[PDB]
Swiss-Prot record:
Belongs to the PTH family. SUPFAM superfamilies: Peptidyl-tRNA hydrolase-like (SSF53178). Its main location: cytoplasm. Gene3D superfamilies: Peptidyl-tRNA hydrolase (3.40.50.1470). This is Peptidyl-tRNA hydrolase.
Length: 194
């Protein structure tokens, strides 16, 4: 119904954070960009890395903010505002504590669940939460006190691999996501198993 015009992948910038769990969304957008032969260009105007490709006669943009995670909204709002992109045409990929490694799910709207990247995006988009999310499971450490260290850590190999698998599964439903056929994307995706 509403074609996706912007896919955002959340993560923290720079070497200490690279390959950390909290960068799951960025990894997805990096994988996507490589698979589609899209270059991600560093563009200070959008506070991130930005790429573009054409699908069905429309430009689709890829964005990896290079703000810190808590200021990701600044990047999304810059780019979506400049191109007059409505929240309903945005997909945000992010790490999801509430699903284990190997599981990816889609969701439309709702809250941030304490994800401070999502929280900033909702805030910056003028309290619009009606964007779509690709939730990439990273597991939960099992107490709230452990969550900061966990998301900012490098998962062991087994969990990294399972994340990669769930990213492949989500790439499998790219055609649906781009078209905005969230119902079909969800049936296909939510039916997979790592």
């Amino acid at each position: 119904m509403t074609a996706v015009q912007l896919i955002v992948g959340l993560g923290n910038p720079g070497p200490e954070y690279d390959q950390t769990r909290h960068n799951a969304g960025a990894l997805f957008v990096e994988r996507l960009a490589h698979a589609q032969g899209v270059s991600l260009v560093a563009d200070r105007k959008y506070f991130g890395l930005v790429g573009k490709f054409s699908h069905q006669g429309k430009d689709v943009r890829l964005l990896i903010p290079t703000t810190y995670m808590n200021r990701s909204g600044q990047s999304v709002a810059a780019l979506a505002g400049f191109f007059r992109i409505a929240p309903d045409a945005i997909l945000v990929a992010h790490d999801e504590l509430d699903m284990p490694p190997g599981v990816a799910k889609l969701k439309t709207g709702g809250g941030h669940g304490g994800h401070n990247g999502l929280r900033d995006i909702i805030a910056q988009l003028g309290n619009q939460n009606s964007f779509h999310r690709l939730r990439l499971g990273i597991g939960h450490p099992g107490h709230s006190s452990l969550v900061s260290g966990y998301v900012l850590g490098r998962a062991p190999r087994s969990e990294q691999e399972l994340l990669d698998t769930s990213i492949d599964f989500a790439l499998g439903v790219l055609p649906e996501m781009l078209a905005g056929d969230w119902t079909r994307a969800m049936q296909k995706l939510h039916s997979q198993k790592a």
